[PDB]
Design a protein around this ligand. Structure first.
Ligand SMILES: [Zn+2]
Ligand SMILES: [Zn+2]
Lengths: 21, 28, 28, 20, 28, 21, 28, 21, 28, 21, 29, 21
């Protein structure tokens, strides 16, 4: 999941936007 | 914006800044 | 334990601590 | 949650209710 | 990227999230 | 100023981009 | 409650949450 | 001790409660 | 070094930054 | 008496040294 | 004051506590 | 870079004071 990617790699704030409500 | 590298609570904090009041779900 | 006022980024931090890897939902 | 912990006061126990 | 109330250390944490290595200046 | 925008009032992350180098 | 991996300031924040206004002693 | 464990390994909240006043 | 308003988790963090591995005692 | 020193009223980092063990 | 090991957001927070009102510039080479 | 130093190695609060305004 994006969450795993941010920590092991890098992620964009835009990808984290997928997790909002 | 730049490509971030976030783990644990830092990621949680960033989720809070991006989503805000709308809230969010944290699913690892 | 104890009871405190938990708001904003602070409440999500407490949530990350209590639930950890289980994840959680934050919805005002 | 908000009406509980932030407005009033809650315990770490209550917070488990929001764990997934 | 909803609008929030960011003060003190919370505001500079978001400056870091947004700017990153580009750096930033913080002057009241 | 930054404070006279995001702290007293409110702002978005996009606005914070104005204080980057 | 889940187990945790806490280092530095993250642990003292954990202690603050768990102990409350009762206070605590940080003895590394 | 417990504080070292938390960082080098893992530890429980109940264990951290040994440090409260 | 300036004088700031430090409460709760913020105060325990400043205490952590100033004292480091020497530890500290937080007794309200 | 520390929260009275830094929270109610402001204080400096030097003065927080008084609470280091 | 002890010496510190500060990375990322942790360093910017130390900066905020050290500079306070004066503000600061975060210039990571 | 003192900031690089703080993270790759260690630094002192006094050195951080160089970046203030
Ligand atoms: Zn705060
Ligand atoms: Zn960290």
């Amino acid at each position: 999941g994006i969450v795993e990617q941010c920590c092991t790699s890098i992620c964009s704030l835009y990808q984290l936007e997928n997790y909002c409500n | 914006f730049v490509n971030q590298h976030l783990c644990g609570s830092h990621l949680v904090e960033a989720l809070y800044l991006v989503c805000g009041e709308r809230g969010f779900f944290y699913t690892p």
